[PDB]
């Protein structure tokens, strides 16, 4: 498993100071190497195809001593030419003062240090055997140091005792280089170009492929694929567990996404934790070898667009993460990064009252050097609410929309999640969380507030994908397989394609500022962390807060109780001329003095919104568009004057949960509803319309899975329309009055379809962990609790010696011609030679499985060139007879020769 025993580490490091030797007196090059937990240890990579893990951090005794205690320190040392074996700095000896060559040349075989039955450190060389001292419980340290690239032609590995420094060659000759693409935002989000992320998640033990795959083709083009990795870890260590290897399943699925010719962000972190190192100096990215990650991801990628930290409230100045200050001071530098490449940074926040002083308003206002550089580069930048902890979702909506109008950040959105929802009670009766609630913040925080992006919703693996029982796909072949959850096809899909097909406007900056009106300045330098960072206590009170619910912390439910006044925005200064158009600027030091008596409040924000409607339901209005949505159990009512059409007016009578758009013209209104229930319940709205000079008609669709039927009566002048459902449709409605005091309508919101990325010239990636298989030995798809380590993305498989064992995965190539495939493997016990390839079902030839290392991290690399035809390819690897010994595939990895 991927804590390690101290056993195992040290085993490893002797391994890999044996294959250092070795590949020195063989002139051997490093072609890659990686520092993972922030370089606790390493993966390397030589040219020979031998990749395996070092350790500068080992795993302590258990016994929970607190103390540094002994343990066998194996080192190398060279005598008259040859390296020989050291035990705690004299010769590694076992009988008569022999000393122990490194290399036998026919042998892998090392030293193993061992603890024996009695307590007692031992170390054996084949069948020689010796005890040292009693082991005691305690802190370790490891014979490794560093890995370091001094120049950049050489690599160094340093070690703790006498053993010298070894260097290597950095193998360079690679392909020709692929220029990155930089200047211009690769993917420029806005209202015309909304953007969704959806996840690819470790939680999901994904299939990139799949997951990418299960998105309709019209959504794909605005779709952006957030590669998420779990910050899942080791509470004594910090090791991750569930994203083991971040940087490799990132890489991995980058790729895919590259090949799939879609846009991908990469989520490293969830509050402080992060699987990469951060930066302090914009000069790390390209001089320290500790953090490639960020500028590789962008030079190598041309679908990619940048990181995605995520919650970012909790976790800080843990053991293993860094403090809010490192982390932002990391962010100055990385929009700098994301600036030169054209992409964005993102960041999410979700509040509790322990978290003000680390919130965005905190963020510019506490750190004046990071907010220079996001006013210089706030089209990168992207501040997004998000709904995971229990309380203040008006406060923290109010200062995100509130970075974002000021001028901070270049885009604003919502991440929306299920686990907002309260705990133990929920709201209006409803302890469990109701997926069609979670229509309504999304819905109306687009449409009202401008929001450009929509992330998950979350959790994931419960509101978007799960993965199934595998599933048969003929030919004996099984396959893993992802399915969409209901409510993910008949919410979130169908609400984008209501933003898509203009039915859903969102507003621009300048157009929210507008409408808006006010913003409350934070000014206040006194007091605690909510006085000087979170909005006024109650500054929702009286406004669109529920009757039921409190102020800040104890504001449980984010469902507004009126849309007469819109999203108030509180933000820290008003960067540029259109942050300074707001019409109304209320400092929040003056707040306590006047504003803080709600009535007074009122009678101003009374003033300067006009009641456009009476009711419970909520109803807010933004040009010819209204989002109308009940929040309450219950049927529930509004009487709405029409602003464009000619009639007089409308009464809705709505199910819990129903939200609505609702689009005004002259002579019609379009309605957009949804309440999706994946149970299946029918709920009933109704429509009343007054003033009609004639009979009106109607047209309705369901959309997705949705049932509807709709009726309608003419009586007394009123239209009314009964509404049957579950889950979305359109309604058109056909009605026209003598009214002519009305506005006109605006033309029609564009919607460009977002470019595609270049097309990747670069490496394919195919994890063995997502072969379609029949009779192999194990699948690994979750390899932290596994004991084989240094493995890409999540897992490998054990294909076994099986005689009918076989795997096959869907390959693609640009054009035709000649490609290398190599084949990531083990082969411990023995050479296995009875495994055959074949391209597009013809037998190509048989892969060189040679004996590979014991130790549990070594991988190596067979390599086959093949002729492969432009587009989709078919690869197989299958047995032709009982093999010698297992072999295990972790991935493979194609690339033009
Ligand atoms: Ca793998």
């Known amino acids: 498993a991927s804590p390690g025993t101290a056993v195992e580490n040290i085993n490893t490091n002797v391994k890999a100071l044996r294959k250092l030797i070795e590949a020195k007196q063989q002139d051997l090059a490093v072609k890659t190497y990686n520092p993972v937990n922030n370089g606790a240890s390493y993966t390397i990579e030589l040219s020979d195809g031998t990749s395996f893990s070092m350790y500068a951090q080992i795993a302590a005794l258990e016994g929970g001593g607190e103390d540094v205690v002994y343990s066998p320190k194996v ?45 007692y450190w031992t170390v054996k060389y084949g069948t020689k055997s010796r ?4 082991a005691v419980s305690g802190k370790l340290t490891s014979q490794f140091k560093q890995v370091s690239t001094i120049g950049d032609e050489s690599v160094s590995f340093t070690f703790t005792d006498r053993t010298p420094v070894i260097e290597l060659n950095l193998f360079k000759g ?53 590669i998420s990795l779990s910050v899942s870890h080791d509470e004594a260590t910090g090791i991750y567990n569930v994203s083991e290897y971040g940087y490799e399943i990132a890489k991995s699925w980058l ?18 934790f992060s699987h990469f190192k951060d930066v302090s100096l914009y000069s790390q990215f390209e001089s320290d070898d500790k953090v490639r990650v960020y500028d590789e991801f962008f030079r190598e990628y041309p679908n990619f667009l940048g990181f995605n930290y995520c919650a970012q409230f909790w976790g800080y100045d843990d053991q293993f993460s860094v403090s809010w200050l490192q982390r932002v001071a990391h962010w100055n530098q990385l929009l700098k990064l994301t600036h030169k490449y054209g992409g964005y940074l993102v960041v999410s926040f979700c509040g509790n009252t322990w978290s003000a002083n680390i919130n965005p308003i905190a963020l510019v206002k506490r750190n004046s050097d990071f907010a220079q550089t996001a006013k210089l580069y706030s089209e990168n930048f992207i501040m997004c609410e998000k709904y995971t902890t229990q309380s203040g979702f008006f406060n923290v909506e109010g200062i995100c929309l509130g970075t974002w109008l000021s001028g901070f950040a270049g885009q604003y959105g919502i991440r929306f999640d299920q686990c907002g929802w309260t705990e133990e009670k929920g709201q209006n009766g409803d302890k469990d969380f109701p997926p069609a609630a979670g229509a309504l913040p999304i819905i109306e925080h687009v449409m009202l507030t401008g929001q450009t992006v929509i992330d998950g919703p979350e959790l994931i693996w419960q509101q978007c994908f799960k993965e199934t029982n595998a599933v048969s796909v003929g030919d004996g072949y099984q396959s893993r397989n992802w399915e969409c959850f209901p409510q993910f096809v008949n919410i979130n899909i169908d609400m984008f394609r209501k933003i898509i097909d203009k039915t859903i406007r969102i507003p621009s900056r300048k157009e929210v500022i ?66 300074n158009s707001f019409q109304y600027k209320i400092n929040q030091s003056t707040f306590e003095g006047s504003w803080s008596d709600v009535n007074t409040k009122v009678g101003k924000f009374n003033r300067w919104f006009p009641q456009e409607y009476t009711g419970e339901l909520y109803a807010g209005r933004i040009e010819n568009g209204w989002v109308v949505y009940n929040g309450l159990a219950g049927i529930r009512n509004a009487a709405i004057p029409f602003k464009y059409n000619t009639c007089d007016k409308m009464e809705l009578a709505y199910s819990k949960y129903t939200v609505s758009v609702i689009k005004e013209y002259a002579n019609k209104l379009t309605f957009y509803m949804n309440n999706y229930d994946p149970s299946g319940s029918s709920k009933t709205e109704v429509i009343k319309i007054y003033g009609c000079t004639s009979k009106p008609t109607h047209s309705v669709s369901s959309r997705a899975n949705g049932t509807a039927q709709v009726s309608e009566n003419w009586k007394e002048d009123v239209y009314t329309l009964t509404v049957t459902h579950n889950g979305p449709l359109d309604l058109t409605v056909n009605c026209s009055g003598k009214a002519t005091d009305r506005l006109t309508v605006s033309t029609a919101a564009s919607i460009q379809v977002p470019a595609s990325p270049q097309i990747y010239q670069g490496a394919y990636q195919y994890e063995a962990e997502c072969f379609d298989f029949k009779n192999v030995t194990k699948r690994v798809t979750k390899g932290d609790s596994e004991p084989i380590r240094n493995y890409t993305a999540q897992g490998y498989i054990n294909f076994g010696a099986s005689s009918a064992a076989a795997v096959r995965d869907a390959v693609t190539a640009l054009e035709d011609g000649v490609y290398t495939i190599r084949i990531r493997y083990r082969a411990p016990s023995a050479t296995v030679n009875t495994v055959d390839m074949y391209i597009n079902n013809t037998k190509v030839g048989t892969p060189e499985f040679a004996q590979t290392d014991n130790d549990n991290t070594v991988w190596n690399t067979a390599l086959m060139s093949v002729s492969l035809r432009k587009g989709a390819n078919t690869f197989e690897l299958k047995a032709n007879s009982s093999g010698a010994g297992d072999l295990y595939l972790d991935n493979i990895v194609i690339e033009r020769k």
């Open 255 to 272: 790729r895919t996404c590259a090949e799939n010719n879609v846009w991908a962000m990469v989520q490293p972190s969830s509050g402080g």
């Open 514 to 579: 507008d409408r808006t009106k006010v913003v409350i300045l934070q000014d206040v330098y006194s007091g605690d962390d909510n006085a000087k960072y979170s909005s006024p206590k109650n500054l929702h009170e009286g406004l669109y807060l529920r009757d039921d619910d409190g102020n800040l912390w104890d504001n449980h439910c984010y469902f507004k109780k009126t849309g007469r006044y819109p999203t108030i925005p509180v933000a820290f200064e008003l960067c540029d001329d259109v942050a």
């Open 75 to 119: 080192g190398a040392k060279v005598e008259h030419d040859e390296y020989y074996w050291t035990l705690d700095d004299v010769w590694l000896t076992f009988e008569n003062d022999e000393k122990v060559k490194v290399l036998d040349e026919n042998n892998t075989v090392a030293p193993i240090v061992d603890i024996n039955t009695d307590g």
């Open 131 to 134: 005890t040292l001292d009693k």
């Open 174 to 226: 690679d392909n020709p280089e692929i220029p990155p693409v930089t200047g211009a935002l690769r993917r420029p989000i806005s209202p015309e170009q909304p953007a969704w992320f959806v996840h690819i998640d470790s939680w999901n033990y994904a299939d990139p492929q799949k997951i990418i795959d299960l998105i309709p083709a019209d959504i794909r083009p605005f779709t952006i694929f957030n």
